[PDB]
Amino acid sequence: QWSGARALEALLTVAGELRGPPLQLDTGQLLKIAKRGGVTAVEAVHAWRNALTGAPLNLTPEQVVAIASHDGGKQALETVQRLLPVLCQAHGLTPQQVVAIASHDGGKQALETVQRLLPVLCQAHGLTPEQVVAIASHDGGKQALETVQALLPVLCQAHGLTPEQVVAIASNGGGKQALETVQRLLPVLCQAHGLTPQQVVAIASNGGGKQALETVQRLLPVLCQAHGLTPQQVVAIASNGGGKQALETVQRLLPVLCQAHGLTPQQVVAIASNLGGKQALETVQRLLPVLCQAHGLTPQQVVAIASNGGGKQALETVQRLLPVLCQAHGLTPQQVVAIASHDGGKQALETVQRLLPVLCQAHGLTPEQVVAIASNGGGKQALETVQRLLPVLCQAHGLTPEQVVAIASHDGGKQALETVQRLLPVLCQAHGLTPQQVVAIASNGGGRPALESIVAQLSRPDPALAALTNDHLVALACLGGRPALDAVKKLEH
DNA sequence: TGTCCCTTTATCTCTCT
DNA sequence: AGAGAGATAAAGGGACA
């Protein structure tokens, strides 16, 4: 008999128990833990179900699943119940910060290293606790924290980096590797190739940073003489996760895409210059003639879809869904292109296929409004949030559907909608803002933090902003969101 | 196997003007 | 509004005890 059977049966038995109180986990949550944390993590959750949920830690089940669902999940669960009170009371961290550090492979190691190194990194190295938390909150967080402790001085003194830069480099998975590589390669890339430290940090500050830097050192000469790429173009391609893969693929496919399809080098660089750039390039090479065939999509439009993170997914999804979206739901191909041309274009396309009939018939939106909401990053999330919150926002809060659509139709739309639903009553009732003013603040990228900043200034007034009326604060918040409010505080004092 | 660390890709949100 | 950046997450491989 297959050996995994006994372990599988154990998994399934324990999993069934966890559907009961006090966690009541669903099928998804259960598979998620089993998939990454394994059967030991599933058993640890059950074993420590009571100690985690209520007094003293009071963790949500979502927080328990998030800690459990990684390699060493069992170890992280034990460690959190032990160290969460310590880190909150002895270092002044929030439970949310402790859970964030815990929620990665080897979270035990990160937690214990934070407990050990936070004081010396803050006192002897000048870091804030937030920076230590951010360094800790990735796979290998322990290695990154120890490497920041060791290398912060030589990186700032011998190599000219700021602590912000070092923290930025450290704050990715593999952070130790990127730090050690930047130490070695910063003089090489700057002096031999005329890169600024700022360009080097940008290349370093992603997962696999070590790989991208070494690949830039290796390929920059070939790319910038043979192919005729500029150093700036190479830096842009390198400055994303999978940067090594994107750079090697540009070397491969730049002449192929230009000659076989008449794409420009600038168009190829743009496609390469996203997360998954390698996948996007290879997919364009395969699919462009399939998409463009017989006055179909233009190359221009194919390039546009491809020129976002996960562009491969958007391209394949357009190939799948262009006909049904146009036949059944009556969209123009220009509209499908618009929806596809953002990060997560695949998710947005599939969500439009799924929710266009419902938002139209059940909620009285136009296809144009559904398209407008879908046509931003996180379009799927905004569409699902509009479906969920249109009734309470309209019926209980007095907003028109037009206003809801406007709030929804920006990056972060979901966050803006949920924040309006939350804070509209206190902003209007308690502080006298009009609904239209609240809608205006929320109808921008960064809607959520702009609303939260306003709420904070109205609830716990900072004298630095006191000279501004509510109307002036609204104007500032619409103009530049949270950053503008913060920028204004700094100007005052 | 269980755990830790590293890399790549995809998705979501916010900033910067 | 459209170009950068972090943020979060899934998932695979190397390593080793």
Residue numbers in the entry: 231 to 723
Mind quoting what the paper says about this structure?
We then present fifteen crystal structures of engineered dHax3 variants in complex with target DNA molecules, which elucidate the structural basis for the recognition of bases adenine (A) and guanine (G) by reported or uncharacterized TALE codes.
The structural observation suggests that Ile34 may not be a major contributor to the affinity of DNA binding by TALE repeats, consistent with the classification of NI as a “weak” TALE code.
